[PDB]
Amino acid sequence: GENCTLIDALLGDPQCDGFQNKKWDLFVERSKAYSNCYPYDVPDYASLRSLVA
Amino acid sequence: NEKFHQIEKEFSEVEGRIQDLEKYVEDTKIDLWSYNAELLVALENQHTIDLTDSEMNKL
Amino acid sequence: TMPNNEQFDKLYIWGVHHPGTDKDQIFLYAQSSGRITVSTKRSQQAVIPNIGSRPRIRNIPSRISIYWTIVKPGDILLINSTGNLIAPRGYFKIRSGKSSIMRSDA
Amino acid sequence: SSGTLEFNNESFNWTGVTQNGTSSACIRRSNNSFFSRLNWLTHLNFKYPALNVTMPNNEQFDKLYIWGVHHPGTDKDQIFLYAQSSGRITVSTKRSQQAVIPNIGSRPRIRNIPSRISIYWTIVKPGDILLINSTGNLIAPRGYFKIRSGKSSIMRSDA
Numbered sequence: 001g002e003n004c005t006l007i008d009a010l011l012g013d014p015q016c017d018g019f020q021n022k023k024w025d026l027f028v029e030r031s032k033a034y035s036n037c038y039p040y041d042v043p044d045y046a047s048l049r050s051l052v053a
Numbered sequence: 054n055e056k057f058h059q060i061e062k063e064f065s066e067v068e069g070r071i072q073d074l075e076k077y078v079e080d081t082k083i084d085l086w087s088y089n090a091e092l093l094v095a096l097e098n099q100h101t102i103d104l105t106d107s108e109m110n111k112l
Numbered sequence: 113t114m115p116n117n118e119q120f121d122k123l124y125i126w127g128v129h130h131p132g133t134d135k136d137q138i139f140l141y142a143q144s145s146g147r148i149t150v151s152t153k154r155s156q157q158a159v160i161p162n163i164g165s166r167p168r169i170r171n172i173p174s175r176i177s178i179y180w181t182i183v184k185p186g187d188i189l190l191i192n193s194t195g196n197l198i199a200p201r202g203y204f205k206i207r208s209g210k211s212s213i214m215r216s217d218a
Numbered sequence: 219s220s221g222t223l224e225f226n227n228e229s230f231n232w233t234g235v236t237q238n239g240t241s242s243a244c245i246r247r248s249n250n251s252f253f254s255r256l257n258w259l260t261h262l263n264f265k266y267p268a269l270n271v272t273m274p275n276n277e278q279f280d281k282l283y284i285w286g287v288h289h290p291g292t293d294k295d296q297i298f299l300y301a302q303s304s305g306r307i308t309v310s311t312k313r314s315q316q317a318v319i320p321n322i323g324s325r326p327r328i329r330n331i332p333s334r335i336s337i338y339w340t341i342v343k344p345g346d347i348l349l350i351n352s353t354g355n356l357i358a359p360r361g362y363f364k365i366r367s368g369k370s371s372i373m374r375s376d377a
């Protein structure tokens with residue numbers, strides 16, 4: 001998921017529309033990843049990321 | 054053996070208690086396993102030397 | 113209301129909009145405050161928007177707080193609100209497996 | 219773990235309010251006083267204007283801001299100090315936001331004080347901006363703490 005985080009693909013950041021409904025075994029987050037949609041934050045970000053992963 | 058999903062072990066932020074605990078857990082695990090590895094290698098090499106010498110003396 | 117009549121847990125991702133000023137709140141929701149209570153038989157979450165200015169990001173001084181709610185089978189999801197709700201469009205199948213995530217540039 | 223109380227004052231533009239509030243429980247050199255690193259903001263001419271203050275981070279290290287919220291004991295105390303029956307404090311950055319609401323109510327007196335102060339902290343990375351938004355009850359900071367990454371620690375002992 002090179003320019004996208006798992007949460008961005010989850011919410012549906014427009015650059016992440018490729019990951020719609022896709023499955024996986026290991027998600028690779030890049031250091032170049034960045035969000036481009038509406039600014040947001042997630043209370044318990046790590047927990048949602050972990051459970052989605 | 055297989056291990057797939059675990060805790061996080063690198064942090065780019067400053068969170069406090071939970072971060073401290075996770076670091077402590079991983080560090081403790083690493084140290085204990087390193088001790089076990091060094092001891093196992095030492096013991097197995099001693100046993101290899103001993104068995105070779107024993108075979109020579111047997112002959 | 114939205115029931116769960118399938119045989120797997122459902123994951124709802126929703127949110128709350130914190131606008132930057134008061135005229136933005138009146139412009140988008142026609143009332144100076146919202147309140148969102150999303151609940152089930154075994155859970156409840158109430159969130160209140162916090163109108164205020166944030167450092168602009170992509171020229172946006174407002175924010176969105178994302179929350180999630182898991183609904184087990186035979187349960188019911190209830191959404192109660194007067195404004196500032198960033199509603200969900202559906203649900204995520206939440207599986208129990210051996211998947212994970214890893215940050216790497218490899 | 220930081221291992222330093224290095225404090226650098228910063229000059230916020232508290233235009234429209236009365237800075238440097240004090241109290242009779244916090245006695246400093248036989249005088250009414252308050253915490254040295256905080257600033258108690260009360261009204262000015264029975265008007266607490268809306269505070270919206272920005273402070274950038276242009277150095278090369280993280281900054282640590284310690285601030286607070288004042289929960290007065292009664293309603294007349296709130297009207298006496300802030301000229302309005304409620305406050306709301308939103309301290310935010312590009313990657314964080316914290317909103318705190320005061321809870322007017324009586325607490326068990328400590329040093330004859332039935333009010334309380336809730337202390338919060340906010341870390342600001344370089345190139346970021348700290349934004350403080352408030353209508354009252356803000357116990358503002360005076361500056362920032364250098365937050366270092368080192369091998370320091372703390373230990374409770376009577377030795």
Ligand SMILES: *[C@@H]1O[C@H](CO)[C@@H](O[C@@H]2O[C@H](CO)[C@@H](O[C@@H]3O[C@H](CO)[C@@H](O)[C@H](O)[C@@H]3O)[C@H](O)[C@H]2NC(C)=O)[C@H](O)[C@H]1NC(C)=O
Pocket residue numbers: 132133165166167168169171173270271272347
């Ligand atoms: C509270 O104060 C903050 C900062 O003092 C205000 O945010 C700042 O708002 C100004 C103008 O609204 C922004 O400047 C603008 O920048 C864009 C960038 O292209 C430019 O097109 C505009 O012409 C203007 O120069 C500034 O970026 C922004 N600062 C931050 C950190 O977001 C905020 O609006 C104040 N709140 C209220 C309710 O007035």
Ligand SMILES: *[C@@H]1O[C@H](CO)[C@@H](O[C@@H]2O[C@H](CO)[C@@H](O[C@@H]3O[C@H](CO)[C@@H](O)[C@H](O)[C@@H]3O)[C@H](O)[C@H]2NC(C)=O)[C@H](O)[C@H]1NC(C)=O
Pocket residue numbers: 147148149192193194
């Ligand atoms: C949760 O959802 C319920 C269901 O709609 C909401 O109850 C409804 O709330 C509205 C406004 O708060 C009420 O409208 C007002 O009712 C009064 C009754 O005297 C009327 O005089 C006003 O002109 C206006 O129509 C509505 O009656 C009420 N419905 C019921 C059945 O109580 C509630 O507001 C929601 N709460 C949250 C936190 O989302």
Ligand SMILES: *[C@@H]1O[C@H](CO)[C@@H](O[C@@H]2O[C@H](CO)[C@@H](O[C@@H]3O[C@H](CO)[C@@H](O)[C@H](O)[C@@H]3O)[C@H](O)[C@H]2NC(C)=O)[C@H](O)[C@H]1NC(C)=O
Pocket residue numbers: 291292324325326327328330332
């Ligand atoms: C709610 O009730 C509590 C307790 O019932 C009230 O707090 C109590 O207030 C009294 C008088 O305001 C305090 O007694 C005072 O003690 C000092 C100590 O030297 C003395 O100088 C005074 O003459 C007086 O005797 C008492 O200590 C205090 N109790 C606690 C636990 O703080 C509280 O004021 C009530 N709330 C409201 C809004 O009335």
Ligand SMILES: *[C@@H]1O[C@H](CO)[C@@H](O[C@@H]2O[C@H](CO)[C@@H](O[C@@H]3O[C@H](CO)[C@@H](O)[C@H](O)[C@@H]3O)[C@H](O)[C@H]2NC(C)=O)[C@H](O)[C@H]1NC(C)=O
Pocket residue numbers: 133134135163164165268269270306307308351352353
């Ligand atoms: C966050 O900081 C902003 C920046 O000052 C605050 O916005 C300002 O809030 C005050 C009072 O809430 C507003 O004053 C009132 O405005 C109305 C507008 O119709 C006017 O009719 C009243 O007589 C009064 O002057 C002020 O306009 C408003 N400024 C802007 C640019 O929106 C805000 O209140 C702060 N919020 C928090 C939670 O701290």
Ligand SMILES: *[C@@H]1O[C@H](CO)[C@@H](O[C@@H]2O[C@H](CO)[C@@H](O)[C@H](O)[C@H]2NC(C)=O)[C@H](O)[C@H]1NC(C)=O
Pocket residue numbers: 002003
């Ligand atoms: C990931 O993002 C980078 C940067 O946003 C993309 O690189 C851009 O590629 C387009 C066309 O290929 C160019 O117009 C831009 O100039 C490039 N960026 C820069 C900074 O020069 C990259 O293509 C993206 N890749 C994926 C898979 O999303």
Ligand SMILES: *[C@@H]1O[C@H](CO)[C@@H](O[C@@H]2O[C@H](CO)[C@@H](O)[C@H](O)[C@H]2NC(C)=O)[C@H](O)[C@H]1NC(C)=O
Pocket residue numbers: 237238
């Ligand atoms: C509030 O008190 C602080 C100190 O507790 C004052 O800080 C002084 O500020 C002036 C310029 O404004 C400096 O020249 C002094 O060196 C500062 N003194 C200290 C000890 O830092 C501040 O001025 C006071 N503000 C008001 C409005 O009274």
